[PDB]
Curated annotation (Swiss-Prot), chain B:
Residue span relative to the full protein: 3 to 174 of 858
Binding-site positions, GTP: 24-31, 156-159
Phosphothreonine carried by residues: 52, 55, 57
Disorder noted: Spinocerebellar ataxia 26: A form of spinocerebellar ataxia, a clinically and genetically heterogeneous group of cerebellar disorders. Patients show progressive incoordination of gait and often poor coordination of hands, speech and eye movements, due to degeneration of the cerebellum with variable involvement of the brainstem and spinal cord.
Protein name: Elongation factor 2
Modification N6-succinyllysine occurs at: 150
Assembly mode: Binds to 80S ribosomes. Actively translating ribosomes show mutually exclusive binding of eIF5a (EIF5A or EIF5A2) and EEF2/eEF2. Interacts with SERBP1; interaction sequesters EEF2/eEF2 at the A-site of the ribosome, thereby blocking the interaction sites of the mRNA-tRNA complex, promoting ribosome stabilization and hibernation. Interacts with HABP4; interaction takes place at the A-site of hibernating ribosomes and promotes ribosome stabilization. Component of the mRNA surveillance SURF complex, at least composed of ERF1, ERF3 (ERF3A or ERF3B), EEF2, UPF1/RENT1, SMG1, SMG8 and SMG9.
Domain of life: Eukaryota
Post-translational modification: Phosphorylation by CSK promotes SUMOylation, proteolytic cleavage, and nuclear translocation if the C-terminal fragment.
Transmembrane segments: none
Compartments it resides in: Cytoplasm; Nucleus
Family: Belongs to the TRAFAC class translation factor GTPase superfamily. Classic translation factor GTPase family. EF-G/EF-2 subfamily.
UniProtKB/Swiss-Prot annotation, chain C:
SMART domains: Ribosomal_L14 (SM01374)
Predominant localisation class: cytoplasm
UniProt family annotation: Belongs to the universal ribosomal protein uL14 family.
Lineage summary: Eukaryota, Metazoa, Chordata, Craniata, Vertebrata
Subcellular localization(s) per the UniProt record: Cytoplasm
Keyword field: Cytoplasm, Phosphoprotein, Ribonucleoprotein, Ribosomal protein
Subunit: Component of the large ribosomal subunit.
Keyword Ribonucleoprotein among record annotations: yes
Organism: Homo sapiens
Function: Component of the large ribosomal subunit. The ribosome is a large ribonucleoprotein complex responsible for the synthesis of proteins in the cell.
Entry-annotated residues carrying Phosphoserine: 8
Protein name: Large ribosomal subunit protein uL14
Curated annotation (Swiss-Prot), chain D:
Residue location of crosslink Glycyl lysine isopeptide (Lys-Gly) (interchain with G-Cter in SUMO2): 14
Organism from which the protein derives: Homo sapiens
Subunit structure comment from the entry: Component of the small ribosomal subunit. Part of the small subunit (SSU) processome, composed of more than 70 proteins and the RNA chaperone small nucleolar RNA (snoRNA) U3.
Entry-annotated residues carrying ADP-ribosyl glutamic acid: 35
Family according to the record: Belongs to the eukaryotic ribosomal protein eS6 family.
Gene name of the record: RPS6
Function: Component of the 40S small ribosomal subunit. Plays an important role in controlling cell growth and proliferation through the selective translation of particular classes of mRNA. Part of the small subunit (SSU) processome, first precursor of the small eukaryotic ribosomal subunit.
Source organism superkingdom: Eukaryota
Protein name: Small ribosomal subunit protein eS6
Residues of the full protein shown: 1 to 60 of 249
Subcellular location: Cytoplasm; Nucleus, Nucleolus
PTM comment: Ribosomal protein S6 is the major substrate of protein kinases in eukaryote ribosomes. The phosphorylation is stimulated by growth factors, tumor promoting agents, and mitogens. It is dephosphorylated at growth arrest. Mono-ADP-ribosylation at Glu-35 by PARP16 inhibits polysome assembly and mRNA loading, thereby inhibiting protein translation.
Length: 118, 172, 131, 60
RNA sequence: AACUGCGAAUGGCUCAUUAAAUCAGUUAUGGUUCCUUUGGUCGCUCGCCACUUGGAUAACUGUGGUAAUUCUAGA
RNA sequence: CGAUCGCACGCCCCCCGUGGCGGCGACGACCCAUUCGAACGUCUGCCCUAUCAACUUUCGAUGGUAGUCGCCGUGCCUACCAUGGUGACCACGGGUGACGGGGAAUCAGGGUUCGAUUCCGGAGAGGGAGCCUGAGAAACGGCUACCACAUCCAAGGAAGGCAGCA
RNA sequence: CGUCGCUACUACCGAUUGGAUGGUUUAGUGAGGCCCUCGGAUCGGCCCCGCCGGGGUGCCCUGGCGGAGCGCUG
RNA sequence: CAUGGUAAUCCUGCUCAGUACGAGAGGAACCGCAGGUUCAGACAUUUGGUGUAUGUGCUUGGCUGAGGAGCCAAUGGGGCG
């Protein structure tokens, strides 16, 4: 079920009208009536003939939705949505204890190294 | 449908290869039966379904559907374990391999049938129902017994009995 | 399957058509049409996908002075395709074939008529583009 | 006619075959990357709008 | 395994083409390009991440298609 | 106008004590020079042919001039003016069973023939033509089109280039 | 010594607009590439701005959601 | 309706069936299906043709003082209809 469009006049051709043109190069064309195909065989520019639709489109005689998707919910091997949530939300003054503990441990090791060398 | 050099692994795996030669009277579906064989299966073979196939490796064979020169094909197949205990003889693995030679059984007695028999261990004798046992089938099994080839009967063309003759099952 | 449909003939016996193949023959002078019963003073004509015969006029010399079977693949006389579309091409073109239908060249230049294509599978396989 | 469905958010993408032409009308003659309503399939594809990531011709 | 970097413009073969053309010697580019090697230069400018910023992406997992390719897609 | 990567690791501590400072590299780079070169150029030099003596100049031929492009010099090409340039010192045209040279054969001397071929330069990768990347290709065991061959094909397409070793 | 007589060879002329082979070109068509002007299937961000929100303190830090700024840039 | 005229014809392809038959090579038929040739009888939706609707543009020469509007040139030509 195909409604063609005229290769010159740019018109919806209904099944009962028009003809086809097949070119030795391989190109195919469709014309509405004798007038259109005579113009085409005359090599006339349709954007010059005053009623070809593409002419009006050129001359402006007549007359988008980028919807975003920001998602991150996947779990990660060795953990899950719960586990990642739990280890992401120790914000209420729980990180600091681990923070200072690691810093002091690093400080204690460097004093241990100071002892070993001297 | 595997690569070219894995024929080694099964082909040296003794007691697993099977060598057949199909023998029948003329036009008895040797080509058709072997094409049915090659379609589904294949060690590299595809699933061609257009009547004649790799059985006839020569012109003026497909243009008269008459077999002239015997052709060999390598084929593969994977077997389900139920058959792997079905197999009474020595069985080694699931990847069973076939060396099949489709050979013309014409009344000229193109010695290709004999060549295939010599290079094979088993024979797939194909005999039609409505045509009965043909003379050339008797000929080909006559050299099969002489050369000590294991024969196996593959009777064909019952669609003629069903639709053409509209025969009764007991008469079948 | 199904046999072809009658089409506008528009290609009489006296016509001169070109070869769309690689056999090197250029011209084709229709000689008769295969399968035409005939009539009084009605010179038989060809259409796309008709087994006809023609002589080559311009082309390779060894190929000239002979009568060869041919099939017609192009024409500039229109004909309805039973669906209300009328199709015609620039020129009337055909390709030299053997008796059975195997076109004796190996390539076809330009498009082919779909009726000719499914009437002759060999040329359809070789046909550049279908139309 | 094989339909490859995918949840990029959840994975679990699988393949299903279909034949309902009336079903296929709904996504026939559509552009790619087009949000189309596939709710026609069964009574349980409701509330599912889908995007056309592409497809593969009969000749692969 | 993949991404990345380099090489793939070497070499091998043949002499069809080519008659001041190639080529031989000579001499110029102060009228030009030159990855690489090597030696130079790399704080010369005043002008809310720098204790390091963003995004994709193969390989990899899963779902396919094609008679068919060092064809590939979608997630 | 380094948001890089290894291999040793170490040093100053007043303010301290956690920061501050240094080694060996590698990978880098705008550009300069050098190297490998490449390209176009100077002068001279080539077999036979006059039953090839006048060519070239519309369609660049010979220049000037301003330009385009090219990496640059240069009708490379364009726009305007000049009618020019070569030729019996063989121009031009035709053949060449012509890739050139180093050299090979012959050897009183003189010369005569042969150099497709391992070295050098040039060209080609079936015949044309156009390209991408790349410093370097008009590349072809790179791509694209045509022609000519030519493989498989469920006929819907896909893939070719042994003047490389065999 | 010639003509004439016999036989083979060899070229030469020859209607056939002989035919073929390449190259050079004239006019015409012209695939393909590159360049140019466009063109915009898609893919981004700013504008988020209805907000739940709120903080230096309804004058938001914003935690994410949601329309969409129906613009502004790639 | 007495009467008189009278019209249909042939060939393909599929299937039958690669079957009957035949050693093989070869190789039909009937039912059915899809067409096609010749002839006949109509008809213009479509496609083409015709075109002086002298319908509408374009245009040669001349003519109405020019613009507009037109006309003549035995259908002025020509494009479309
Ligand atoms: Mg007569
Ligand atoms: Mg040579
Ligand atoms: Mg790093
Ligand atoms: Mg030589
Ligand atoms: Mg050399
Ligand atoms: Mg490079
Ligand atoms: Mg090259
Ligand atoms: Mg090249
Ligand atoms: Mg009567
Ligand atoms: Mg008129
Ligand atoms: Mg006038
Ligand atoms: Mg007036
Ligand atoms: Mg007037
Ligand atoms: Mg008058
Ligand atoms: Mg008309």
């Amino acid at each position: 079920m195909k409604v063609e469009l005229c290769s010159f006049s740019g018109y919806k051709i209904y099944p009962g009208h028009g003809r086809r043109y097949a070119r030795t190069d391989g190109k195919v064309f469709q014309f509405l009536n004798a007038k259109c195909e005579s113009a085409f065989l005359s090599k006339r520019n349709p954007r010059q003939i005053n009623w070809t639709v593409l002419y009006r489109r050129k001359h402006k005689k007549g007359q988008k939705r980028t919807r975003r998707a920001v998602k991150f919910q996947r779990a990660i091997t060795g953990a899950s949505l719960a586990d990642i949530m739990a280890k992401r939300n120790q914000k209420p003054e729980v990180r600091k204890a681990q923070r200072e503990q690691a810093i002091r441990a690093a400080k204690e090791a460097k004093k241990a190294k100071q002892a070993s060398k001297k | 449908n595997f690569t070219v050099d894995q024929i080694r692994a099964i082909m040296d795996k003794k007691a697993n290869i099977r060598n057949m030669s199909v023998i029948a009277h003329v036009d008895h579906g040797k080509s058709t039966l072997t094409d049915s064989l090659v379609c589904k299966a294949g060690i590299i073979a595809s699933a061609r379904a257009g009547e004649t196939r790799f059985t006839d490796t020569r012109k003026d064979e497909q243009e008269r559907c008459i077999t002239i020169k015997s052709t060999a094909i390598s084929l593969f197949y994977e077997l389900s374990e139920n058959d792997l205990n079905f197999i009474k003889q020595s069985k080694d693995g699931a990847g069973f391999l076939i060396n099949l030679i489709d050979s013309p059984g014409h009344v000229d007695f193109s010695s290709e049938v004999t060549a295939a028999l010599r290079v094979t261990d088993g024979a797939l004798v194909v005999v039609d129902c409505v045509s009965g046992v043909c003379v050339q089938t008797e000929t080909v099994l006559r050299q099969a017994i002489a050369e000590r080839i294991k024969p196996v009967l593959m009777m064909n063309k019952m669609d003629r009995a069903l639709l053409e003759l509209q025969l009764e099952p007991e008469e079948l | 399957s199904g046999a072809k449909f009658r089409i506008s003939l528009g290609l009489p016996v006296g016509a001169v058509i070109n070869c769309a193949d690689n056999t090197g023959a250029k011209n084709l002078y229709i000689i008769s049409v295969k399968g035409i019963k005939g009539r009084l003073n009605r010179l038989p004509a060809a259409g796309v996908g008709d087994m006809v015969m023609a002589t080559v006029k311009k082309g390779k010399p060894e190929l000239r002075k002979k009568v060869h079977p041919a099939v017609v693949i192009r024409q500039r006389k229109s004909y309805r395709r039973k669906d209300g579309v009328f199709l015609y091409f620039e020129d009337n073109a055909g390709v030299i074939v053997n008796n059975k239908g195997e076109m004796k060249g190996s390539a076809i230049t330009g498009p082919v008529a779909k009726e000719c294509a499914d009437l002759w599978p060999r040329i359809a396989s070789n046909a550049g583009s279908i139309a | 006619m094989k339909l490859n469905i995918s949840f990029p958010a959840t994975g679990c993408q699988k393949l299903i075959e279909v034949d309902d032409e009336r079903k296929l009308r709904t996504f026939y003659e559509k552009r790619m990357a087009t949000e189309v309503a596939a709710d026609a399939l069964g009574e349980e594809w409701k509330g599912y709008v889908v995007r056309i990531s592409g497809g593969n011709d009969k000749q692969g």
